[PDB]
Amino acid sequence: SHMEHVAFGSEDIENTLAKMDDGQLDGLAFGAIQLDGDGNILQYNAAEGDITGRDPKQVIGKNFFKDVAPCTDSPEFYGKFKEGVASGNLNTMFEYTFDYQMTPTKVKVHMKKALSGDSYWVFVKRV
Ligand SMILES: *C(=O)/C=C/c1ccc(O)c(Br)c1
């Protein structure tokens, strides 16, 4: 096996992904980003890089909302993220279109608080 057998949207996804280093995150079928509470990128997997074109190694440390993903700097994406950061229970799923310096690509996004401190998952798959 060369993949992690975890489905997008699984109810306990934050528990299953707590064990995963960067290599294991690259075994997921869906894009996975981990952000801090300000939106800085802590982790970013291969599937996400294939969806978006960004280089998973280069995006670490950039700010998702200010730097790499201005199309998500909106109430419908960033607004939802920061509300869930504030409440401590982020868990929201919605479709969205990624269109900054790329062919517009419609995705399903699932944001969910991670078990580690100051850490929040953004999961992405195509629709
Ligand atoms: C809109 O600006 C979306 C940009 C975007 C979406 C998803 C990822 O992973 C990146 Br780095 C940028």
CATH code, 72: 3.30.450.20
Resolution (Å units): 0.9
Task: For residue 5, tell me if it sits in a domain.
Answer: no
Three-state SS letters, 36-90: CCCCEEEEECHHHHHHHCCCHHHHCCCEHHHHHCHHHCCHHHHHHHHHHHHHCCC
Q: Token pair of 77, please?
A: 């994406």
Give 113's contacts (C-beta < 8 A, 6+ positions apart). Answer: 14, 84, 85, 88, 89, 90, 91, 119, 120, 121
Domain that holds residue 89: 12-126
Question: Nearest residue CA, atom 5 of ligand 1?
Answer: 69
12 C-alpha vs ligand 1 centroid, how far in Å?
A: 25
39 within 8 A of 64, measured Cβ to Cβ: yes
CA–CA separation, 125 and 116 (whole Å): 23
Q: Which of 92, 70, 69 is nearest to 82 (CA)?
A: 92
Task: For residue 4, tell me if it sits in a domain.
Answer: no
Backbone CA torsion sign across 22, 32, 66, 88 = negative
Task: For residue 28, tell me if it sits in a domain.
Answer: yes
72 within 8 A of 94, measured Cβ to Cβ: no
Task: For residue 6, tell me if it sits in a domain.
Answer: no
Atom from ligand 1 closest to the CA of residue 48: 9
28 C-alpha vs ligand 1 centroid, how far in Å?
A: 18
**What is the separation, in whole angstroms, between the first and last Cα of the chain?**
26
Task: For residue 86, tell me if it sits in a domain.
Answer: yes
Domain count of the fold of the chain: 1
Atom from ligand 1 closest to the CA of residue 49: 9
